[PDB]
RNA sequence: UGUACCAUUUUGAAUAAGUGACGACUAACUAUGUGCCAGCAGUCGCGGUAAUACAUAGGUCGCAAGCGUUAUCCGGAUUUAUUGGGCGUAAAGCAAGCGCAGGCGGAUUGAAAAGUCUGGUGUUAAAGGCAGCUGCUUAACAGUUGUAUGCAUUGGAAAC
RNA sequence: UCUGAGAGUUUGAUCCUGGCUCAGGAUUAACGCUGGCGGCAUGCCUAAUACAUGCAAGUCGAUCGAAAGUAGUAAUACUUUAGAGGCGAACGGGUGAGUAACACGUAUCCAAUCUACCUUAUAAUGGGGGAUAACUAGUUGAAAGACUAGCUAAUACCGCAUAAGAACUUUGGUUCGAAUCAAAGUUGAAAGGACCUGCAAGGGUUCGUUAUUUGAUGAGGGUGCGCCAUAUCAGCUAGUUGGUGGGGUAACGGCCUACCAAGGCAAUGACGUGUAGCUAUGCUGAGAAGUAGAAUAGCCACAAUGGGACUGAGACACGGCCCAUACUCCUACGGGAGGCAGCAGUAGGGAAUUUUUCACAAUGAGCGAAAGCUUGAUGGAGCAAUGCCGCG
RNA sequence: CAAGGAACUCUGCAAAUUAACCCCGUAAGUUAGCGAGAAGGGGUGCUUAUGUAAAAGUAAGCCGCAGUGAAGAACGAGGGG
C-alpha cells in the first residue's frame, strides 16, 4: 500500500536506486496505490552514469508491494519490498531489463512490454 | 560455438568421475596408512598410487613424493 | 616434432626459399636454431646448393624432411648417407 | 662440475634476526655516460649455519644456490679473519 | 591466367601536365587595378593615389605525376656544453661562519689485483645497416657471403 | 679507416651576451589543386567502442558396433558416418588495455625442474570382467530437447597372471649432495586393426600397446647487470623478517599451515604519483647519441568484465566448461542464445586509413597407411598517387 | 498496531531508536589541552575441556526466533547567529 511520499526501490537498468512517491494519480484523493497503478514519482538517488539525472519528476508503475492485495481467485500474493518501473506516457519503460518479479495485474492493465521484458511473473 | 567442443564435453565428464573415483580411494588408503601403521596398508598403498602413475591422473612426482613421505613414516623404527 | 620445411623469404611471385631446421609448433618464416642452405625455385639446374654439414646432425639427432625437402634430399644423396650409417 | 659463482667479497652489518645474517657488497662500476667510477651498496643475504659467529666487521664471501626463501638467497662459501 | 611476355600483327601524333614562387634571405620582373581599404606574410615587413610584396594580366624561373600547406621527430642548436658552455658590469658566487655524510687528497717500500691493459673460449636469432656479389630489361627491389658490438668466464701484466 | 658548410633578425652605426626563425632529411600522414601507365612497399595512430551479415580446425571405416544406400537368389562385396573411439584442439590469427617489474634485453645456474607426437637401443604386445552410446519403447515440447526402462561391440574402462630393467625404501662397502655397483622387500605392464603365408600347426610383414635407456625439443623456476619522470612523494611493510614441525607443489620457497621472536626495505630514493608493452630496429646525427617503438621478427600480456576448476602431458583454454556482472538478440510469455581486438563489412568518432574478392596452384599446419579432406593461416586478385622507382 | 516514515505541525513538541561490559575502529578543525564514549561495527546463553592465584581469555559441543534473553544505563551528522 504504497502511498504518497514512499521512497522505495526501482526494479529496472535506469539506474534511479532510490525513488519517492510524489503523487498518486487517478482521482483526487486516492492517497493508495495498489498493484499496477501509476504514480508519479521524483528520483532522489541515482548512479553517475544514468540516463536520469536527480530531481527529475516522472511517472512510474509499481511492481512489487509489501503489504500485498487478495487476489480473486482466493490467493494472496506480497513481496517483501516496494519496487516500480519507470514508463515513458503510453507503455514503455525507460529502461531495457527488469530486476526480480513482477506481479500479473499489469497484464490486464496493459504494461505488456513489461510482462515481455520481466524476469519471472507471478 | 564449433562442433569439435562440445563433443569433448561429453567425453569428459564420464572419465571425470571415473578419476575422481580413483582418487578418493588413494585418499582413503592413505588415510587407513595413518591411522594404523603396517607394511601390508603400505603397500597396498603403493599398489593404488601406481595404477594412476601408469596414466595422468596423478603426477608421478606426486606419487613417489607420498610413497618417500610414507617410508618416512616407516622408518619410525 | 622438429620439421624440416620451407620458408617462403622473397618478394611477390618471386619464392625465395631458405631451408629451415625448424620445431614443428612454429610458425611460417619464423626463428629457428640452425640454418640448411637455400633454394631459389624459379632457377633450375642446382641453383639448390645446401650446407650438407649441420643437416645431417639435424637428421641425427631427430628430423623429419618434408616432400619437397624429400626432393633435395633424393638428387644429392642425403639417402644414401644418412640410412646406411643408420645402422 | 659446471656450476658457477659470483665470487664477492661482502661485509656483514648485523646478524640480529635468528640465525641470519645480513652481508654489504660495493661493486666499482663506470657511469654508464659520464665515465667516472662510482662504488655502490646493494645488501644481500646468508643464514648463519653455526660455524662461525661473525660479529660486527667480519667480511666474507659467498657462492650461488637455490632459493632458500623470499629475501634469503645466497650461501657462505670462504670466510675471511677480521680487522 | 591466354598471365606477363614475344611475334617486321591493325590503325594512328595520334591516348595523357600540372604545380609554387618571382623585395631580401633564395634562382625568377613588367604592366593594370586598389590606395592603411580590400588583402599578404616562415623572418625582416608590405599598401594612407606611380606597390617588382595586395588582386589580376603577361613573362620568367623551382619541382613535376605529383606540387604545395599544416602536424610530428632529429639536425643545424656548442641553445643542457662527457666529448662540448659560463658565473665583475650581459641570466648566474648563497650574507658570513662551525661543520657530519660524500667527493678529492704528500712521499717511500711489499703483497694481493677490484679498476685498468692485453691473450684464449663461449655467447650476443633472422631480417635490417655497411661492403662485395648474384638475379630481376636497370634502379625501386629480391637473394648470397663477409662485416661490427657487449657481456660472462678463463691466462697473464702490475705504471697508476 | 670514418668524417664537422651556413643565414636573417635587438643598433643612428659597432662588438658581444642572448632568444626566435630559415636553408636538410623523415612520416602508418592528412588537406587544396591537378592526375596517364608500369613495378615495388604500405594502407584506424581516434573507440581493448558496439556490432546486421557470410566464412575462419577439423580429420580418420585398415578402431568399433550399428544405421542408410548400391550390386547380389543367397552367400557376399562396395559407398557415407549420426554416434562411440584416436589425434588435433594449448599451434596458427588479432590487439597492446593492463603491467615501472626478474615484464624485457642480456649472461648465467637449475646438486630444484619436467617435456606426448620426434631419436638410439631392450623386454614383452597373455588371458578375463563389467559397462554405454546409437537403437527401441514411453513421458514430454513446434523445435532445441530432457528424462524414464532393455539391448549391444571396440584401439572406452576395470581387476588377474609374470615383470629385462625400472619406481621407492632396507643392508654393505665407492667417489669429490651428487653416481655407480651388489643383495633384499613392496609394487605396478598392453590392444588389437590390415595383410602375407600356413590344409593345418604355426610363422611372418605393416600399422598399433605398455614398460624401459640416450637424446632432440618446448615450457618453467632463480640470480647478475642494464632497462622513465617525480622529494610541490619521508618513512614504508606484520606472511611483512627470520627459525621450528607438517602439508602442499613438476621442483625451491611464509606458498600455506601450528608454535616462537620483531624484524626487514629506505636519501645510493623506499612507499606513492603519472607515464609506458620490452627488445632488434626505423628517422636523424660525423660522434658521443637524440627520437618513435610503423610494416616485420624474439619475448610478454589479453580474449565483453571479474573469479573458479575439470580434462588434457601441455589451458586456468581467443570461435572449451561453471558462476557472477553489464549489454544485446530471438520467442509460441512457456523460455532460450550470444560474445567481430579472426577475414570481409556496418554504425559512431575522426580530418583520416580498403573488397561483405578467388584458390589450396605453391609453403605450411592438422588428420588420415591411402585416396583425400579443412585452412578469410597462406598464396593470389580489387581498391588507394599514400610512399620509392621507371616510362610516356 | 499491518503499509508508509514528518506527509503532522508554528517548530520532529511529544513519543520513538541507542544504551552495561569487553574487543576493532575513529575525520575535519584547534589556542595542540581537545575534538571523542566522535563516527561506524563485532561478542555476551549453557555444558565440557583448557584456563591461572581467582577470573578474564581460548578450543570443542548444544539449544532457542531471540542469549547485559527481565529490571538500569549516551540516538547522531552537517551549516549558521
Known amino acids: 500500500m504504497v502511498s504518497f511520499m514512499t521512497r522505495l526501490n526501482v526494479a529496472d537498468n535506469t539506474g534511479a536506486k532510490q525513488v519517492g512517491i510524489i503523487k498518486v494519480l487517478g482521482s483526487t484523493r486516492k492517497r493508495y496505490a495498489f498493484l499496477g497503478d501509476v504514480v508519479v514519482v521524483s528520483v532522489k538517488d541515482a548512479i553517475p552514469s544514468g540516463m536520469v539525472k536527480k530531481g527529475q519528476v516522472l511517472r512510474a508503475v509499481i511492481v512489487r508491494t509489501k503489504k500485498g492485495q487478495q487476489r480473486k481467485d482466493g490467493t494472496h500474493l506480497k513481496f517483501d519490498d516496494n519496487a516500480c518501473v519507470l514508463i515513458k506516457e503510453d507503455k514503455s519503460p525507460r529502461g531495457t531489463r527488469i530486476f526480480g518479479p513482477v506481479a500479473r495485474e499489469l497484464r490486464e492493465r496493459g504494461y505488456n512490454k513489461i510482462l515481455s521484458l520481466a524476469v519471472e511473473v507471478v | 560455438n564449433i562442433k569439435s567442443n562440445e563433443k569433448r564435453l561429453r567425453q569428459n565428464i564420464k572419465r571425470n568421475l571415473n578419476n575422481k573415483g580413483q582418487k578418493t580411494k588413494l585418499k582413503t588408503n592413505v588415510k587407513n596408512f595413518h591411522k594404523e601403521i603396517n607394511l601390508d596398508n603400505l603397500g597396498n598403498v603403493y599398489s593404488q598410487a601406481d595404477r594412476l602413475a601408469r596414466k595422468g591422473i596423478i603426477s608421478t612426482n606426486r606419487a613417489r613424493r607420498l610413497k618417500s613421505r610414507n617410508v618416512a613414516v616407516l622408518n619410525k623404527t | 616434432m622438429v620439421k624440416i620445411r620451407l620458408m617462403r623469404m622473397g618478394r611477390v611471385h618471386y619464392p625465395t626459399y631458405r631451408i629451415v631446421a625448424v620445431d614443428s609448433r612454429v610458425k611460417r618464416d619464423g626463428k629457428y636454431i640452425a640454418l640448411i642452405g637455400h633454394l631459389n625455385p624459379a632457377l633450375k639446374e642446382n641453383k639448390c646448393k645446401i650446407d650438407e654439414a649441420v643437416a645431417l646432425e639435424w637428421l641425427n639427432k631427430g628430423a623429419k624432411p618434408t616432400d619437397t625437402v624429400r626432393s633435395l634430399f633424393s638428387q644429392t644423396g642425403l639417402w644414401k648417407k644418412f640410412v646406411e650409417s643408420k645402422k | ?83
Do not use: C, M
Open chain 4, 1 to 83: 662440475k659446471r656450476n658457477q659463482r659470483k665470487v664477492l667479497i661482502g661485509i656483514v652489518k648485523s646478524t640480529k634476526n635468528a640465525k641470519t645474517a645480513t652481508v654489504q657488497v660495493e661493486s666499482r662500476f663506470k657511469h654508464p655516460l659520464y665515465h667516472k667510477s662510482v662504488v655502490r651498496h646493494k645488501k644481500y643475504q646468508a643464514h648463519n649455519e653455526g660455524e662461525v659467529l661473525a660479529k660486527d666487521g667480519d667480511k666474507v664471501q659467498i657462492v650461488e644456490t637455490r632459493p632458500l626463501s623470499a629475501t634469503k638467497r645466497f650461501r657462505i662459501a670462504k670466510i675471511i679473519e677480521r680487522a
